[PDB]
Structures are given as C-alpha cells and as structure tokens.
C-alpha cells in the first residue's frame, strides 16, 4: 500500500574451488564415487511442520 518497490537488475553465481593437486583431486573423486562412501545429510530442525 505504501508503494515501497524493489527491482532486481542482475544475478550471477559465484563459486570457489580449492586448488587441489590433480593427483589428489582425482584420487578423492575416485573415493567419493564409491558405492559405500556416499554422503548423507539431515535437516537441523528435522521436522514436519503443521
């Protein structure tokens, strides 16, 4: 009602890579592609809001 308005101009994604040595990077990739070394997660709240 008070006419406070917003206007997005542009958006660019940024990311940062650890300059891992290529041999170690490849070894780490081969490790994490294993079936058993999968990555798990859980939401901190863990809940089902109603």
């Amino acid at each position: 009602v008070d006419g406070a308005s917003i206007k997005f101009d542009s958006i660019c994604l940024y990311a940062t890579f650890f300059p891992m040595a290529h041999n170690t990077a490849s070894t780490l990739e081969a490790m994490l592609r294993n079936d058993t070394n999968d990555q798990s997660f859980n939401d901190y709240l863990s809940a089902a809001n109603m």
């Binding site: 009602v1 006419g3 308005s5 917003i6 206007k7 101009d9």
Partner: protein, 67 residues
C-alpha cells in the same frame, strides 16, 4: 625556482604499472560521457554505486490498494 639547472631525471624510474588510473592524473570521463575526477582526487577514496533510477513511481500500486 631560480632556474634549477639539475638533470631533469637523475633518480631511477620504475616501469609504469599496467592498470587503470595510474598512468597520469587527468580529468577523466565515464563510458557514456560523465566527467570523472582525477585519480588522486579525495572523492575517489570510497565507492559511489550511485544507481540513480529507482523503480517506476508505484501510483498503479496506490490505485490497486484503493481498489
């Protein structure tokens, strides 16, 4: 200045660093023609984003609120 007759450049000079605003201090200009103050000006210490155009006057929003 009583006609200092010394060699105009006796000290060692250092290669000009290649980036913006260090070659010389002259009244510059924007991309679209706005004047730019010299490199060693005080007013260039901080940053002035100076995005001028706000969003269009939301009179349509006022009418929508009324309706």
């Amino acid at each position: 200045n009583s006609f200092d007759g010394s060699i105009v450049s006796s000290y060692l000079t250092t290669r000009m660093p290649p980036w913006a605003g260090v070659r010389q201090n002259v009244m510059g200009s924007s991309i679209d023609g706005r004047p730019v103050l010299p490199a060693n000006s005080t007013t260039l210490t901080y940053e002035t984003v100076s995005g001028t155009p706000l969003e269009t006057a939301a009179s349509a929003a006022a009418s929508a609120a009324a309706a």
